[PDB]
Amino acid sequence: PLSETKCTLKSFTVEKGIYQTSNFRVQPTESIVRFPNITNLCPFGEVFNATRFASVYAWNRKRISNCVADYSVLYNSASFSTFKCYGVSPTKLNDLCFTNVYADSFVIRGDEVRQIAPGQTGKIADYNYKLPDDFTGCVIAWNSNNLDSYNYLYRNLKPFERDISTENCYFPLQSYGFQVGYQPYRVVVLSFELLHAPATVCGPKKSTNLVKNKCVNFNFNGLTGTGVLTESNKKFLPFQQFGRDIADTTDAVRDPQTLEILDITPCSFGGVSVITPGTNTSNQVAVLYQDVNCTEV
Amino acid sequence: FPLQSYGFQPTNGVGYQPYRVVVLSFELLHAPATVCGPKKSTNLVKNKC
């Protein structure tokens, strides 16, 4: 700790005075993952392997829930041409469990693929399909020079809008009978919403036994963090999933697969200081632990 | 077997078209340099801006 004072003050000499050095943090013991009791695999083949996409004029959205389906098959095997993710990343997708997943499905030409982006202008974005400005998800414009191509027609509107109708006339009924620059492709969009409801679709990470009353790093549906898990007299409402405090700190989370009341108290942290008498006189050092019961060192 | 041969065959797509990547890893000026630009060296000047 004398050497700590020599380290912090950036000098080989120290004098009379307590010097703040660092913070005494108790390291986590072993990682714990508690995903819900669900173990089925969701049919992502009923969106990606589904190749009869729905034209952007009236596209199809698939709702999926209640599983721990893996993203590894889509992440590793890059059987696509464009993998642009806003929010999540292709590698970290396996760590988080999501409240709900909607897989938008439509087609668009080889050009104007950049119009599938938050705010990016263009006729397709102006009338057909407009992603919200605060979009969060992955866009996969996987190659369809042989699947897309007639029936796949195409033509301001709200984010995630949907309105199919027909009215010197004027009608937007346009098709495309293709058979590479002008060639249409297949575009699938995954729209995630996080931390809004009980997470239902999780990752492949195997569940791990829960631990209590110990500083342990945890992962509850994706709530990555480190802390000690204790019991509290507070009762979660049956509709409720997980609590929070000011500064968006999730102090209380009802642990899934057990539905038990828990409080994420932060691990034992205490301001470690030094009471040194100065290298001129002595070298014996005294250490302070700011506001910790002696029991915890 | 931990290793395979793709082959990078000739008349195929960009996936099978080999791009012979050469990676030039440089380093900041922190040591004597044995490689230098083709700049024409001149003399030095002392006690002058």
């Epitope: 049919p43 083949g45 009923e46 969106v47 392997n49 589904a50 190749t51 009869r52 996409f53 190659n143 020079n145 042989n146 699947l147 897309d148 191509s149 007639y150 029936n151 796949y152 058979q179 | 195929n12 797509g13």
Partner: antibody, heavy 119, light 110 residues
Framework: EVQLVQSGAEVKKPGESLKISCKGS????????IGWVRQMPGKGLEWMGI????????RYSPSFQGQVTISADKSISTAYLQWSSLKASDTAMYYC????????????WGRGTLVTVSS | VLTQPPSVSGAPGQRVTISCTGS?????????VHWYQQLPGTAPKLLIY???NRPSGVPDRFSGSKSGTSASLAITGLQAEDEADYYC????????????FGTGTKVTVL
């Protein structure tokens, strides 16, 4: 002829590795799908796999994936069908036929090969 | 996986129909249903594509249609040459398989 042709009568023995070839000629193979079809004698036919010689994109049937290997030799317009361990119960009629997209059907068929493998 | 009437027998000069029955996810999903003629011992030939389009050179006696969960082949005026195997088609997205094949139909004329 405008067809997906193969070799003549084939008689072999189990345990040997055989890669039969299907040749494409007489059309613009770049814009169309080209694939194969299996058909057991006296039982319903099953498309095994299909490839797109435009960019050589490979697709197989769930029942017939991995057991066989194909390749679209688009430089010579050839479709392969690779067997590593031919089975005695593999006797059937194999059709290499090229299909279409959007509508997703077959419009032209090959004559097929009488593949009979027995001990 | 796409059930068909296994065998059809009929006199020459008869109007017969083949039921391309499926499920709500393969045939009744609204996707296109296509058809062929599989002459016994020879290569199959296309009969109906798109449920309304007709190939070049086909006789008009054969026509195709779809009715909800099942599809129907219109055979008008059977003749003695029509002794052949007939099989279904459709397209399935979610099933991964770009083509799906029917069980099969025998159509025989004496």
């Amino acid at each position: 002829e405008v067809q997906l042709v193969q070799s003549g009568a084939e008689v072999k023995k189990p345990g040997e590795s055989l890669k039969i070839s299907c040749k494409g000629s007489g059309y613009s193979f770049t814009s169309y799908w080209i694939g194969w079809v299996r058909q057991m004698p006296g039982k319903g036919l099953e498309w095994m796999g299909i490839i797109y010689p435009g960019d050589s994109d490979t697709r197989y049937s769930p029942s017939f994936q991995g057991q066989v290997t194909i390749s679209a030799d688009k430089s010579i317009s050839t479709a392969y069908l690779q067997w590593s361990s031919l089975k005695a119960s593999d006797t059937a009629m194999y059709y290499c036929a090229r299909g279409v997209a959007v509508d997703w059907y077959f419009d032209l068929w090959g004559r097929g090969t009488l593949v009979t493998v027995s001990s | 996986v796409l059930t068909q009437p296994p065998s059809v027998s009929g006199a020459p000069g008869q109007r017969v129909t083949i039921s391309c029955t499926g499920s709500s996810s393969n045939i009744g999903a609204g996707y296109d249903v296509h058809w062929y003629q599989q002459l016994p011992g020879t290569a199959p030939k296309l009969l109906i594509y798109g449920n309304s389009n007709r190939p070049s050179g086909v006789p008009d006696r054969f026509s195709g249609s779809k009715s909800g969960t099942s599809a129907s082949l219109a055979i008008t005026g059977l003749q003695a040459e029509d002794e052949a195997d007939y099989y279904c088609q459709s397209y399935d997205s979610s099933l991964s398989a770009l083509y799906v094949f029917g069980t099969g139909t025998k159509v025989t004329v004496l």
